[PDB]
Amino acid sequence: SDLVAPSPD
Amino acid sequence: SDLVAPSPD
Amino acid sequence: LFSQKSFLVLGFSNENESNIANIIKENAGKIMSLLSRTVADYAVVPLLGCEVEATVGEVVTNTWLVTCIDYQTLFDPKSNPLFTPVPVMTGMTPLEDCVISFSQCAGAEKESLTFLANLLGASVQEYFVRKSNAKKGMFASTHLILKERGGSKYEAAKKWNLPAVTIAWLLETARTGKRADESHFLIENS
Amino acid sequence: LFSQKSFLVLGFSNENESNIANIIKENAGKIMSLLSRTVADYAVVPLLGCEVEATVGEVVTNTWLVTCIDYQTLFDPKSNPLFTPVPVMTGMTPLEDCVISFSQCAGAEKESLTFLANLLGASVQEYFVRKSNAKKGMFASTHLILKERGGSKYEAAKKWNLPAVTIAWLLETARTGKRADESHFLIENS
Amino acid sequence: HSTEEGLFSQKSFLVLGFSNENESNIANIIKENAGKIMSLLSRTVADYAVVPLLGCEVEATVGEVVTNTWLVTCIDYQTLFDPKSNPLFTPVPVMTGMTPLEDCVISFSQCAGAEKESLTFLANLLGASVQEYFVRKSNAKKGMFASTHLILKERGGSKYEAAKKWNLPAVTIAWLLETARTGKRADESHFLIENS
Amino acid sequence: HSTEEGLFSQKSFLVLGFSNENESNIANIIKENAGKIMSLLSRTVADYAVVPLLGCEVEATVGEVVTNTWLVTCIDYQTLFDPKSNPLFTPVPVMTGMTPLEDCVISFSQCAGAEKESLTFLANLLGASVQEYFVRKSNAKKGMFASTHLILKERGGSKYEAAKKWNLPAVTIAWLLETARTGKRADESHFLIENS
């Protein structure tokens, strides 16, 4: 992608 | 020039 | 000049208060007390206004005082918007990317206009220029603020296609905290 | 947890003071008086510090309190720079053109780091991105702030050639009011 | 620590008391670091007046009076040093006309650059010779003179150990400044580097 | 690397072409480092003639003609640099009266002290402005101008990476010297820091 997701917590 | 001078006062 | 007029001086540091009272006395005006005597003919306040706790004759700015003394004429406070408190949306900097030069403005008026421009975030340069120059230390101007069609800087704004606008443009920007639309205030439409 | 420890709570609005005193009492700590009793073991203050008029045991931040309660462990205040007042050059916004995303930060630590970034003028986005996108409402990131070599965002910073820096970078920027040199704090040199 | 941040961005300076050459040199250095230069007839109060090490007249109101030693030190380390943190950053009090260090030979340790240049100026003004190298014996053939005093900032380093080993006085910068201030050669025993 | 060894022990110098102020300043610096100062009427040939960056007349035979840039650099690093190892250590050829860099704004990386001061002098002589900080956008409010060129010595460092990232030219010192020597703004593409 072009877009890195959250640190989910 | 390229540059207009003050309102001297 | 100010013979038979009386003044309160409010909102200033101790030093500036004493300085303004002295200028007033030189033009034959009288200075009043806290919990005060009578209602003063004029209250002199800072440009942006301040608290006015007493009923007073006309709330006026130090800009008005010095302009009256400079032209030795008692101007109506209603004749210029800088003679009375100027509404400012506190904390707003709508002109942060602008570079202003003034034309046809002098003395106290020019000082106050410069204060307002900087407070809103613009930088003010004495000279009006179209190309930044690192060696002479001048930045390209974005706006000309003036009063009349005419003059060197007017002509320059036309040659360089830069907006040349009325003082009303700056006061409305200050009042709202948003950059006014220059195209509603062009000097060309005045 | 906080059995036999006593606390002053200082510098907060009335509401926030009462809220922090209540959290302290739930972990068995005791809350002290003005003109005070004895010198408290801990004084809890805001993140940026405040006036501490009494000799006290350790000046600590509300960030320390919540982190201790969250991990149910009494951390040494010296073990993390956010557990004690953070020096901030007041009025300075050295990161005004930056866009930060954080990695490996959670809870109270992440909240405080975000507070500091915004106070210095940066905008903080939960997601780390390399190209602005109007439709999804995300702006390209300039900086990654993290703790360790590793993780999704670390790898992304490398692919996109964006600086990935330590928390020390932000605290030093805050302390001086000038953007620190990222190249002295790279995660790669840690 | 400042990348590509301007050091003096949004600060303004008067420069007073210097020769034409040093005036242009100082204005030029200030401008390279984003500072602004104000006029003698300017409307407003400058943030700083930059003056010589021993000071000069500052008649117009300014924010802080600072020395070029302060200016140059800030620019060299790209760090905004507090002017009060080192006594050479603001005018230095000197009893004019006194030469109390006339038979002394000083070497400095742990001083570099602008600071060292100004300390050397002061020692020469008080009548002393300043030598770059710290040696215990004059040697005519090699053109070196033995130093009488080491001035330094902290315990440690080659010249510090050499002064203990050769049993020569090692004193703080305050010793030199105190002598200049009073016009009398101060007592070395109050300023031993070992006491601190 | 020299403890308490004198840097210029047993060397002699003429100092030519400077003002009275710089003359005394240079003689004083030489003497602090154990060098000898010779007379205009002296018997013998001095080891060195110290001259301005652009040179001046040297009518008496001397060992090597060197610039104060060389002098000061040696003294600052307590290292005896070879005068041929850096082109600014001996007079620098300048086509007098040419301003080929008149619209340029230069920042330097990896240059410090005396070297940097002399390179800045040269850029101003050729008509350019020198800015301490390397930025890509002028900002009127903060008083900073965007730089047009980075001049540096090696690949690496914050300003190098910034010049690649912002796609601005990064050139060797030779570019600046070559322009001065010829009086025409030289071709940046022969001097990219990346090619070396």
Numbering used by the authors:
A (entry chain R), B (entry chain P): 360 to 368
C (entry chain D), D (entry chain C): 552 to 741
E (entry chain A), F (entry chain B): 546 to 741
Task: Give passages from the manuscript.
53BP1 and TOPBP1 are multi-domain scaffold proteins that individually contribute to the genome stability functions of mammalian cells.
However, the 53BP1-pSer366 peptide did show a clear interaction with TOPBP1-BRCT4,5, albeit with a more modest affinity (Kd = 20.6 ± 1.9 μM). We were also able to obtain co-crystals of the 53BP1-pSer366 peptide bound to TOPBP1-BRCT4,5. The phosphoserine side chain engages with the topologically conserved TOPBP1-Ser654 and with the side chain of TOPBP1-Lys704. Additional specificity is provided by the hydrophobic packing of the side chains of 53BP1 residues Ala364 and Pro365 around the protruding side chain of TOPBP1-Tyr678, and the packing of 53BP1-Leu362 into a hydrophobic pocket formed by the side chains of TOPBP1-Tyr678, Val680 and Met689. The identified binding site in BLM - 300-FVPPpSPE-306 shows strong similarity to the 53BP1-motif we have identified - 362-LVAPpSPD-368, and binds to BRCT5 in a very similar manner, but quite differently from the proposed binding mode of the MDC1 SDT motif, which we have recently shown plays no role in mediating MDC1 interaction with TOPBP1.
